[PDB]
Amino acid sequence: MEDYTLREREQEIYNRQVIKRPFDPDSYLTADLHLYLKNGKTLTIHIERNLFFSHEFTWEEICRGKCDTQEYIDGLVADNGGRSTHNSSYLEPVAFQLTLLGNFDLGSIHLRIGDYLGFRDGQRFPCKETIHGRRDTIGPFMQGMSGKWAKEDYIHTYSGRFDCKTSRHPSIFLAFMRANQDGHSSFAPENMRNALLYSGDKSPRYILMDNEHTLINNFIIPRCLPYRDQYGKDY
Amino acid sequence: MEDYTLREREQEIYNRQVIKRPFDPDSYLTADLHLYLKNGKTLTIHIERNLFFSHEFTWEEICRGKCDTQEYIDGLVADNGGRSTHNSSYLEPVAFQLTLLGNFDLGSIHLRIGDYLGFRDGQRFPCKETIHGRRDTIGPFMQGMSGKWAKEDYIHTYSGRFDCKTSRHPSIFLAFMRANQDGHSSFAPENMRNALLYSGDKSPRYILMDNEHTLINNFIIPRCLPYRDQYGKDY
Amino acid sequence: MEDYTLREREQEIYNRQVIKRPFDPDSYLTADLHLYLKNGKTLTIHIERNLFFSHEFTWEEICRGKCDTQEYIDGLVADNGGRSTHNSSYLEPVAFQLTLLGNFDLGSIHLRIGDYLGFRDGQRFPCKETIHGRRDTIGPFMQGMSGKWAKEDYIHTYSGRFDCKTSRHPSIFLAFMRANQDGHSSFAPENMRNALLYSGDKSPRYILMDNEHTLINNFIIPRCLPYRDQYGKDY
Ligand SMILES: Nc1ncnc2c1ncn2[C@@H]1O[C@H](COP(=O)(O)OP(=O)(O)OP(=O)(O)O)[C@@H](O)[C@H]1O
Ligand SMILES: Nc1ncnc2c1ncn2[C@@H]1O[C@H](COP(=O)(O)OP(=O)(O)OP(=O)(O)O)[C@@H](O)[C@H]1O
Ligand SMILES: Nc1ncnc2c1ncn2[C@@H]1O[C@H](COP(=O)(O)OP(=O)(O)OP(=O)(O)O)[C@@H](O)[C@H]1O
Ligand SMILES: Nc1ncnc2c1ncn2[C@@H]1O[C@H](COP(=O)(O)OP(=O)(O)OP(=O)(O)O)[C@@H](O)[C@H]1O
Ligand SMILES: Nc1ncnc2c1ncn2[C@@H]1O[C@H](COP(=O)(O)OP(=O)(O)OP(=O)(O)O)[C@@H](O)[C@H]1O
Ligand SMILES: Nc1ncnc2c1ncn2[C@@H]1O[C@H](COP(=O)(O)OP(=O)(O)OP(=O)(O)O)[C@@H](O)[C@H]1O
Ligand SMILES: [Mg+2]
Ligand SMILES: [Mg+2]
Ligand SMILES: [Mg+2]
Ligand SMILES: [Mg+2]
Ligand SMILES: [Mg+2]
Ligand SMILES: [Mg+2]
Ligand SMILES: [Mg+2]
Ligand SMILES: [Mg+2]
Ligand SMILES: [Mg+2]
Numbered sequence: 001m002e003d004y005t006l007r008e009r010e011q012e013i014y015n016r017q018v019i020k021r022p023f024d025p026d027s028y029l030t031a032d033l034h035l036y037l038k039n040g041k042t043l044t045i046h047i048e049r050n051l052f053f054s055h056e057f058t059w060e061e062i063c064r065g066k067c068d069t070q071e072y073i074d075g076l077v078a079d080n081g082g083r084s085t086h087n088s089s090y091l092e093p094v095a096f097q098l099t100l101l102g103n104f105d106l107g108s109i110h111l112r113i114g115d116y117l118g119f120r121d122g123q124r125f126p127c128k129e130t131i132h133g134r135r136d137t138i139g140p141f142m143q144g145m146s147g148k149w150a151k152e153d154y155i156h157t158y159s160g161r162f163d164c165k166t167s168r169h170p171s172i173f174l175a176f177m178r179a180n181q182d183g184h185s186s187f188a189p190e191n192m193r194n195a196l197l198y199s200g201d202k203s204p205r206y207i208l209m210d211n212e213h214t215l216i217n218n219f220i221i222p223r224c225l226p227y228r229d230q231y232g233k234d235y
Numbered sequence: 236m237e238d239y240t241l242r243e244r245e246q247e248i249y250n251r252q253v254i255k256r257p258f259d260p261d262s263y264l265t266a267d268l269h270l271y272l273k274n275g276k277t278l279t280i281h282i283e284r285n286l287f288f289s290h291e292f293t294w295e296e297i298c299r300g301k302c303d304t305q306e307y308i309d310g311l312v313a314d315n316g317g318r319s320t321h322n323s324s325y326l327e328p329v330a331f332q333l334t335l336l337g338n339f340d341l342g343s344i345h346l347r348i349g350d351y352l353g354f355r356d357g358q359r360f361p362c363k364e365t366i367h368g369r370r371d372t373i374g375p376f377m378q379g380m381s382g383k384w385a386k387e388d389y390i391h392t393y394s395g396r397f398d399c400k401t402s403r404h405p406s407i408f409l410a411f412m413r414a415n416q417d418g419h420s421s422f423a424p425e426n427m428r429n430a431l432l433y434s435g436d437k438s439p440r441y442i443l444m445d446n447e448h449t450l451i452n453n454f455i456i457p458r459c460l461p462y463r464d465q466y467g468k469d470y
Numbered sequence: 471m472e473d474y475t476l477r478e479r480e481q482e483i484y485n486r487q488v489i490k491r492p493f494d495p496d497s498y499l500t501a502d503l504h505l506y507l508k509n510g511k512t513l514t515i516h517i518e519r520n521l522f523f524s525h526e527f528t529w530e531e532i533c534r535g536k537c538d539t540q541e542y543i544d545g546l547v548a549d550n551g552g553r554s555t556h557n558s559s560y561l562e563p564v565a566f567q568l569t570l571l572g573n574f575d576l577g578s579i580h581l582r583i584g585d586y587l588g589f590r591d592g593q594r595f596p597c598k599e600t601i602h603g604r605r606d607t608i609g610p611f612m613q614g615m616s617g618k619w620a621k622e623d624y625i626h627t628y629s630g631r632f633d634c635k636t637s638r639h640p641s642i643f644l645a646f647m648r649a650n651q652d653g654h655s656s657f658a659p660e661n662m663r664n665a666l667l668y669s670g671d672k673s674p675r676y677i678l679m680d681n682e683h684t685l686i687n688n689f690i691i692p693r694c695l696p697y698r699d700q701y702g703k704d705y
Contacts, residue, residue, distance in 0.1 A: 021597060030596040046587070050601045052428075054435035070443065077442055078453040101597060108432060117281070118437040125459050126265040127256060127336060131285045131433045173436050177428060187427035192657035193522075193647060195431070196665070197578060198601045200524035201643050202588040207547055208540065218548040224595050287663075289670035305678065312677055313688040343667060352516070353672040360694050361500040362491060362571060366520045366668045408671050412663060422662035430666070 022103050022154045025186065026050065028202075029102030029178055032225060034215070035062065035093035042215045043093065046205040047174075050198050051186055052108075054175040057204075059116050062170065063091040065206035076116035076169050092169055097159035098138070099226055100176075101149065104156070106139035108177035111158070113166035118173070120166070135166060145226050147234035155226040157234075257338050257389045260421065261285065263437075264337030264413055267460060269450070270297065270328035277450045278328065281440040282409075285433050286421055287343075289410040292439075294351050297405065298326040300441035311351035311404050327404055332394035333373070334461055335411075336384065339391070341374035343412035346393070348401035353408070355401070370401060380461050382469035390461040392469075492573050492624045495656065496520065498672075499572030499648055502695060504685070505532065505563035512685045513563065516675040517644075520668050521656055522578075524645040527674075529586050532640065533561040535676035546586035546639050562639055567629035568608070569696055570646075571619065574626070576609035578647035581628070583636035588643070590636070605636060615696050617704035625696040627704075 002008075021027050028048040035043040043065050047053055059076070072089060074082030098111060112133050114120035121134040142156035149155045162168050180186060187195050209215035212230060220227040220235055227235045237243075256262050263283040270278040278300050282288055294311070307324060309317030333346060347368050349355035356369040377391035384390045397403050415421060422430050444450035447465060455462040455470055462470045472478075491497050498518040505513040513535050517523055529546070542559060544552030568581060582603050584590035591604040612626035619625045632638050650656060657665050679685035682700060690697040690705055697705045 018598070024600065026600045026602060028596060028599050028601070048588070048596055048599070052431050054432055056436055056438040058438050058440070074443075078457065081453045108428075110432075110436075112436075117440055117442075118283070126263060126283055127459055128253070129263050129283070130259065130261045131263070131436055132261060171438070175432050175435065177432055185424060185428070187431070188424055189655060189658055192427065192662065192665070193578075193655070195427070196522050196657070196669075197524055197580075197645050197647055199431075200645065201526055201580075201582075201601055203526040203528050203641070205528070205587055207587075208544075218551045222548065224597055287666050289667055291671055291673040293673050293675070309678075313692065316688045343663075345667075345671075347671075352675055352677075353518070361498060361518055362694055363488070364498050364518070365494065365496045366498070366671055367496060406673070410667050410670065412667055420659060420663070422666070423659055427662065430662070434666075 019152070022101065022152075025178070027102070029053070029104055029176065030100065030225065031102070031104075031174070031176060032097075032099050032227075033057075033172070033174060034097040034099070034227075036095045036097075036212075037093055038090055040211050042209045042212055044205075044207040044209065044215065044219065046207055048202045050178070050201065051195055052175070052177045052199070055204070056118060056171060056173040058171050059169065061206075062093065062172065063089060065208060073116065088168060093162055095159065095161045096172075097157060097228065098142075098174075099145075099155070099157045099228070100142070101155055101226055103154050103179050105177050105179040106142060106156070107137065108175070109139050109142070110136055110173060110175040111138045112136050112173040113162065113170045114173070115167045116169060116171060118171045145228060145234040147226050147228075148224060149226050150234070157226070157228045159228070254387070257336065257387075260413070262337070264288070264339055264411065265335065265460065266337070266339075266409070266411060267332075267334050267462075268292075268407070268409060269332040269334070269462075271330045271332075271447075272328055273325055275446050277444045277447055279440075279442040279444065279450065279454065281442055283437045285413070285436065286430055287410070287412045287434070290439070291353060291406060291408040293406050294404065296441075297328065297407065298324060300443060308351065323403060328397055330394065330396045331407075332392060332463065333377075333409075334380075334390070334392045334463070335377070336390055336461055338389050338414050340412050340414040341377060341391070342372065343410070344374050344377070345371055345408060345410040346373045347371050347408040348397065348405045349408070350402045351404060351406060353406045380463060380469040382461050382463075383459060384461050385469070392461070392463045394463070489622070492571065492622075495648070497572070499523070499574055499646065500570065500695065501572070501574075501644070501646060502567075502569050502697075503527075503642070503644060504567040504569070504697075506565045506567075506682075507563055508560055510681050512679045512682055514675075514677040514679065514685065514689065516677055518672045520648070520671065521665055522645070522647045522669070525674070526588060526641060526643040528641050529639065531676075532563065532642065533559060535678060543586065558638060563632055565629065565631045566642075567627060567698065568612075568644075569615075569625070569627045569698070570612070571625055571696055573624050573649050575647050575649040576612060576626070577607065578645070579609050579612070580606055580643060580645040581608045582606050582643040583632065583640045584643070585637045586639060586641060588641045615698060615704040617696050617698075618694060619696050620704070627696070627698045629698070 031047045033045040072084040112120045138158050142158045145155050266282045268280040307319040347355045373393050377393045380390050501517045503515040542554040582590045608628050612628045615625050
């Protein structure tokens with residue numbers, strides 16, 4: 001019989017290479033910020049970076065992906081300072097899920113949800129603000145998952161609603177960095193050239209799906225990404 | 236009497252903590268580039284960063300915040316190379332004010348106003364250009380101010396017109412860095428991870444106000460930012 | 471006679487200063503990514519940076535510079551997952567030319583052409599991807615040129631089509647760094663402040679020309695940039 005062939009041994013080694021690839025320092029960290037929309041559609045901000053990412057997604061970036069929009073924004077910019085007839089935008093998301101596939105340094109993950117002008121935790125003066133907020137380092141709150149990548153340590157999910165605890169009309173700061181358990185830094189003087197040369201790969205993608213089911217089958221599953229659906233099931 | 240209570244002593248200390256917070260290395264540097272528009276409205280580019288900022292705002296970013304616009308741009312891109320019927324855009328600003336609240340290294344502030352393609356000081360060949368221009372390091376030209384933050388050393392204002400000395404149809408490069416009077420660098424090998432992790436917080440905001448009075452009362456005053464109005468009065 | 475005057479000696483020295491200026495570490499590296507469009511127009515992405523550049527141009531950035539566009543994008547995002555009636559976009563480019571004027575480190579030039587989501591070389595899983603691709607480091611494949619800058623070593627051109635070998639509906643990652651033949655790094659701890667302070671100058675420009683002839687005479691020639699026209703002639 002061919003019950004334990006050299007062909008099969010080779011595959012087994014290749015399986016391990018594939019499963020451990022996220023730990024490869026020249027791989028990507030993959031983060032997906034899923035935003036759940038008022039018409040039941042999903043908007044996924046898909047980000048891949050080798051080493052680090054730091055970007056604040058504006059209300060405009062989140063809501064797309066005229067004078068009426070402007071009048072509305074006026075009211076988000078200044079309390080009681082706009083002439084809009086509606087309290088909230090049809091285009092704002094109602095909930096979110098941040099999911100990760102990569103060797104992330106969990107202590108480096110920042111998710112700060114603020115108002116239109118990026119004010120978070122009710123702290124509304126530029127002079128009082130700092131880069132370290134209350135609801136900010138979500139690392140400890142990220143759950144593990146089963147699904148395709150069950151039993152690995154490089155998938156994590158965190159979700160919530162856009163309610164008054166954070167903001168109902170949001171901008172969202174997201175940052176993260178790749179883990180390093182070894183002594184030599186990838187930001188060391190020897191490596192800064194590379195940290196910056198590859199800093200732009202890739203640009204965030206804004207992916208609209210007709211509903212969560214469509215998101216799962218047209219993107220999550222075929223791209224082999226982790227995901228927790230609204231019923232709690234991990235893929 | 237309660238003429239000098241422990242309650243009041245505590246407040247006094249808190250006042251000092253607040254007043255000195257801009258010096259806190261985990262605070263934000265706040266810069267506002269106010270642009271004065273041809274319909275009397277104001278467009279404020281509001282920027283907060285912990286450590287550094289470097290971005291060239293394009294004509295498109297400044298003028299927003301079709302084929303007619305394109306024909307016009309053609310003429311800015313190449314002398315006498317476009318078919319537009321107008322000499323300038325209704326959407327271009329006529330004057331500007333850069334104001335700062337933060338422990339800025341004044342020698343690090345660059346404001347370079349160029350034409351559509353970012354050519355400054357009449358130097359129009361990419362091969363001749365450098366990152367150091369004539370009208371560029373505005374530090375020495377920044378004035379102090381009174382107003383809310385009178386008697387502090389971390390507010391500064393600089394203004395001017397968009398005329399032929401710089402450009403009447405502008406793009407604008409703005410960079411700055413936080414001061415450091417101490418020996419250990421925030422770009423040191425130990426700190427580069429952080430310099431880049433927080434580099435994106437926050438995104439620039441583009442804030443449109445109906446007029447300068449509205450800007451002052453709906454944004455400057457309630458956000459506790461410094462500002463010099465068109466009559467020279469500091470807030 | 472005035473056959474060899476001090477006036478002429480001065481000019482000769484100035485000619486050398488000008489010709490060698492690209493080697494000046496405070497000059498710009500200039501890169502132009504020319505994209506050739508289906509209506510015969512050209513779109514030039516014009517980039518100048520002092521030290522490094524790293525950005526992935528999205529399909530949206532390339533194609534500009536509604537529900538129909540969305541339905542089309544759906545199909546690029548997921549195989550057979552969109553309802554569009556057309557196979558390709560009228561707005562996609564058909565070929566490209568990357569040309570450089572600057573003291574580029576040729577080993578630092580990355581040009582990775584991927585599909586809508588930035589997948590390159592047929593590798594379509596985020597977990598399998600790395601920052602080093604097959605068709606990626608184009609340095610060795612860049613040709614020298616004659617034209618204005620004949621006999622210099624700081625001009626290079628590389629071109630190709632957007633076909634199935636790369637992608638017919640592309641996003642494009644472009645990175646590069648300035649050469650350094652000396653011992654002290656411009657990313658060294660002493661210099662990181664500067665590497666980042668000037669990192670944003672300039673923003674990429676998206677320049678539309680009516681045809682290649684117009685591109686050459688309205689931009690290439692008067693800006694003194696190198697260029698190879700469709701007949702192989704260098705300017
Ligand atoms: N001195 C204090 N004693 C008790 N509670 C406080 C005190 N200061 C703030 N809090 C409470 O802490 C919570 C968060 O307040 P906040 O985020 O404004 O923090 P803070 O300590 O006041 O910081 P800052 O000086 O930047 O305003 C609020 O519930 C607030 O009432
Ligand atoms: N190359 C690596 N770099 C960083 N971490 C690693 C690497 N290889 C393994 N690890 C860590 O060790 C853990 C276990 O690895 P591995 O799967 O090889 O062991 P195992 O015997 O199958 O036991 P386990 O049930 O923990 O997987 C991984 O989940 C990962 O967090
Ligand atoms: N050799 C020179 N002698 C006197 N004036 C000069 C000389 N070169 C330039 N200038 C003057 O200096 C001013 C600025 O010129 P410009 O910004 O082009 O500087 P530059 O010294 O010529 O630099 P570059 O070599 O980059 O062109 C102009 O008024 C110009 O006439
Ligand atoms: N923690 C700090 N970091 C950096 N600079 C500081 C710090 N504290 C004070 N300074 C500098 O010293 C100046 C004076 O500080 P302070 O207000 O404590 O002194 P003062 O006795 O009230 O006199 P002054 O009239 O200068 O304020 C400040 O304006 C500031 O520029
Ligand atoms: N073990 C192998 N033996 C022979 N050819 C291979 C092998 N693996 C891949 N190839 C071939 O190499 C070419 C490129 O494949 P690909 O880019 O997927 O590289 P790869 O080595 O399989 O990397 P990865 O493990 O990331 O998929 C293809 O023509 C493929 O058929
Ligand atoms: N300052 C510099 N920094 C970096 N490289 C330089 C510098 N000066 C010259 N070189 C390199 O040396 C080459 C030749 O320089 P130069 O033109 O001064 O010599 P030449 O005698 O005219 O011979 P050639 O025919 O090589 O030009 C240049 O093409 C360039 O690549
Ligand atoms: Mg292999
Ligand atoms: Mg408080
Ligand atoms: Mg395991
Ligand atoms: Mg306190
Ligand atoms: Mg000159
Ligand atoms: Mg004082
Ligand atoms: Mg000179
Ligand atoms: Mg393979
Ligand atoms: Mg020579």
